[PDB]
Amino acid sequence: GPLSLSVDAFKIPKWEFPRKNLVLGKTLGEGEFGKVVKATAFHLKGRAGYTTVAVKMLKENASPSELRDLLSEFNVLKQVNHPHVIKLYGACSQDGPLLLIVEYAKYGSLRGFLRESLTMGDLISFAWQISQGMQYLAEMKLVHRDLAARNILVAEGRKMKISDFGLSRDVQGRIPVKWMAIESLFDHIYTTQSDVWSFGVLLWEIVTLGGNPYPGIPPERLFNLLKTGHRMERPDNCSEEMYRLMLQCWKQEPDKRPVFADISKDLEKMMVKR
Amino acid sequence: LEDPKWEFPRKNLVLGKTLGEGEFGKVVKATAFHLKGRAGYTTVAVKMLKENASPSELRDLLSEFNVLKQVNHPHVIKLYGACSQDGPLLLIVEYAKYGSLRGFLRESRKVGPGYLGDERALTMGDLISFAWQISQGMQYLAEMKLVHRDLAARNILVAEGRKMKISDFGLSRDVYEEDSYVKRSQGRIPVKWMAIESLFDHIYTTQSDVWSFGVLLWEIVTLGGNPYPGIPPERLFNLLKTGHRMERPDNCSEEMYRLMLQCWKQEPDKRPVFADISKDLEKMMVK
Numbered sequence: 001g002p003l004s005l006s007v008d009a010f011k012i013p014k015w016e017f018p019r020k021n022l023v024l025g026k027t028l029g030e031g032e033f034g035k036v037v038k039a040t041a042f043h044l045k046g047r048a049g050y051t052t053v054a055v056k057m058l059k060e061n062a063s064p065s066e067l068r069d070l071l072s073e074f075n076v077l078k079q080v081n082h083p084h085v086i087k088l089y090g091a092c093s094q095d096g097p098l099l100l101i102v103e104y105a106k107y108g109s110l111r112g113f114l115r116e117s118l119t120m121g122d123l124i125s126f127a128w129q130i131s132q133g134m135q136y137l138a139e140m141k142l143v144h145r146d147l148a149a150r151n152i153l154v155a156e157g158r159k160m161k162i163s164d165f166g167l168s169r170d171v172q173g174r175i176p177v178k179w180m181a182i183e184s185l186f187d188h189i190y191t192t193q194s195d196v197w198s199f200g201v202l203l204w205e206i207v208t209l210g211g212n213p214y215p216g217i218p219p220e221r222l223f224n225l226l227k228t229g230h231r232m233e234r235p236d237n238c239s240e241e242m243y244r245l246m247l248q249c250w251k252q253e254p255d256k257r258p259v260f261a262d263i264s265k266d267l268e269k270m271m272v273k274r
Numbered sequence: 275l276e277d278p279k280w281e282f283p284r285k286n287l288v289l290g291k292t293l294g295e296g297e298f299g300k301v302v303k304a305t306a307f308h309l310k311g312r313a314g315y316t317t318v319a320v321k322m323l324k325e326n327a328s329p330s331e332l333r334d335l336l337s338e339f340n341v342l343k344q345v346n347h348p349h350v351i352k353l354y355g356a357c358s359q360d361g362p363l364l365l366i367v368e369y370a371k372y373g374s375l376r377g378f379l380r381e382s383r384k385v386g387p388g389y390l391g392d393e394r395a396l397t398m399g400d401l402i403s404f405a406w407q408i409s410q411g412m413q414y415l416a417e418m419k420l421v422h423r424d425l426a427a428r429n430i431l432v433a434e435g436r437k438m439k440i441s442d443f444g445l446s447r448d449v450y451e452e453d454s455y456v457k458r459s460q461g462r463i464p465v466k467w468m469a470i471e472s473l474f475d476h477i478y479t480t481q482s483d484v485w486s487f488g489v490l491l492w493e494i495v496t497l498g499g500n501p502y503p504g505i506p507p508e509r510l511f512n513l514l515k516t517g518h519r520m521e522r523p524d525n526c527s528e529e530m531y532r533l534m535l536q537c538w539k540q541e542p543d544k545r546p547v548f549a550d551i552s553k554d555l556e557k558m559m560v561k
C-alpha cells in the first residue's frame with residue numbers, strides 16, 4: 001500500500017546522517033506525538049565537533065498512521081527553511097529505528113514554558129514569531145492543522161519554533177476538538193483559514209500563560225456552543241485589542257478571519273505603539 | 275440520541291481513580307447507584323474521553339457504545355449503561371478486578387505462587403483456558419459480523435474468577451455487507467498485531483482477527499511478552515513479506531506453536547476460523 005511504498009523508498013546523501021555519529025541522551029517528552037530525546041551529533045551538516053539536537057522517533061507499539069506521520073514530517077521539513085519553523089538536520093534510516101534529527105529547543109514546549117512562568121511585550125513577540133512562521137507556511141501552500149501551545153517550541157533566546165508537522169497537508173480527525181475550526185468540526189474542511197482559528201486558540205493560550213481552552217466544557221458539548229455563536233470570553237490580563245484579534249480568528253465565516261499577514265501586521269503595530 | 279434501555283442518571287454515578295489512560299481513551303473505577311435492577315451501589319468501570327480528545331476518539335467511543343448495545347457474551351465486556359446527555363459521554367461497564375491480561379500475566383512473573391509450568395497460581399492449562407475463552411468470544415463476534423481489529427493482551431480484561439473479557443471496541447467495524455472492512459487511510463492498530471494483508475492492503479476480516487489472535491497466543495505463553503522484541507515496526511513490512519514469523523517461544527508446546535503459525539499464514543483462507551481455534555484449544559486441554 002501507500003505506506004509500504006514509502007517505507008521501502010525511504011530505506012532504499014543530503015539528509016542521511018551516520019548512526020554512529022549520533023549519541024542519544026535523556027528523554028525530553030513522550031506521548032501520542034511519539035518520543036523526543038536530547039542527543040549530540042558529530043559532524044552534523046558540515047559543523048565542527050558535536051551539535052546538541054533533538055531526535056524524534058516512534059513510540060512503543062506504533063501504528064501505520066504514526067509511521068506515515070513521521071515520514072510525512074521528514075517530507076515536509078526537507079522543503080521548509082524559516083527562523084520560526086523547527087529546522088531538520090537529517091535522518092537515520094539504515095540502523096535500527098527511524099530517527100529524525102532536528103534543532104534542540106532548550107526551554108521545551110511553549111505551553112510548558114508559559115506554565116512554569118514575562119511581560120506582555122514578550123507574549124506579543126511570541127505570537128508575532130509564530131505568525132511569521134505561519135505566514136511563511138501559508139505562502140508555501142502548507143496547512144499545519146495542529147497549531148497549539150504544546151506544538152510550539154521555545155529555543156535559545158526565547159525564539160519560537162513551529163513543530164509537529166505529522167498532521168500537516170498540502171493545499172479520521174486527530175486534531176483535538178478544542179483547537180479546531182467550526183468548518184473542520186462540522187464539514188471536515190482544513191485550510192489556512194482553519195489554521196487561523198487554531199492560532200486564535202494559541203493566542204488565548206499565550207495570554208493565559210498556558211491555560212486550558214474552554215475550561216469545564218467537555219468537547220462533546222463544544223460542537224453546539226460554537227454553532228450557536230458562543231466563544232471564550234476576554235481572559236484576565238488581556239487587552240481589548242488582543243481580544244479583538246482572537247475573536248476575529250474565531251469568526252464563523254472563514255473569509256471574515258484575518259490572514260497571517262494581517263495577524264503579523266497587528267502584532268507589529270502593537271509592539272511599536274507600546 | 276437517548277436510549278432509555280441504556281441511559282443512566284448522572285447523579286447516580288460517582289467516578290474514582292484512573293485505572294488506565296492512553297490512545298483507547300480513559301478508564302476509571304466507579305460506582306453506580308441503582309444500576310439495572312441492583313439495589314444500592316455496584317462497583318463498575320467507566321470509559322470516557324481523555325483530555326484534548328479529537329473527533330476520531332469521540333466517534334470511536336460512540337461506535338463502542340453502539341456495538342456493546344447489540345453484542346452480549348460471557349467473554350465480551352458487559353455494557354450496563356451510559357451518561358450521554360448534558361455532559362461528557364460516559365460508558366458504564368463491568369469492572370475487571372485483575373486488570374488487563376497483559377498486566378495480569380506480567381504480574382505472574384513476580385507475584386507468587388506465579389507460573390508453575392490460588393488465582394495467583396498459573397499453569398499451562400490455565401493459559402490454554404484463557405486462550406479458549408477469548409476464542410469463544412471471537413467466534414461469537416465473527417457470527418455478529420464484527421471485526422475487532424485491535425485484539426491484543428492489553429485489550430483482554432481478567433474479571434472475577436479469572437474470566438476473560440474482550441474489551442476496547444473503538445476500532446471494531448461491521449463487515450455484514452462484504453465480509454471485509456477496508457480503509458483508504460492508515461490504520462491506528464499497532465503494526466506488530468496486524469495481519470500482513472491489513473498492513474499492506476488495508477483489508478480487515480475475521481481472518482485478520484485470527485492473525486491478531488496468534489500474536490495474542492504468543493503474548494499469553496510468554497506471560498505478557500513484547501512481540502517481535504527489538505525489531506522496529508517499519509521492518510515488519512519486509513520481515514512478514516519474506517515469510518519470517520516469531521520463533522517458538524520458551525514455554526510453548528509444538529501443538530501450540532503450530533496453531534500460532536497457522537494463524538500467521540500469508541493466505542487468509544489457510545488460517546483457521548475461530549470455531550476451529552476453539553476446537554484446537556479444547557483438544558490441548560483434554561490431552
Ligand SMILES: Cc1cc(NC(=O)c2cn(C3(C)CC3)c3ncnc(N)c23)n[nH]1
Binds near residue numbers: 073103
Ligand atoms: C520532526 C519533529 C520534531 C518535533 N518536535 C521536537 O523536536 C520537540 C519536541 N519537544 C518536546 C516539547 C516533547 C519534548 C522538544 N523539546 C526540545 N527540543 C525539541 N526540538 C523538541 N516535531 N516534529
Ligand SMILES: Cc1cc(NC(=O)c2cn(C3(C)CC3)c3ncnc(N)c23)n[nH]1
Binds near residue numbers: 374
Ligand atoms: C466501553 C469499553 C470499556 C473498556 N475497557 C475497560 O472497561 C477496562 C479497561 N481497563 C484497563 C486495563 C485500562 C485499565 C480496565 N480495568 C478494569 N476494569 C475494566 N472494565 C477495564 N473498553 N471499552
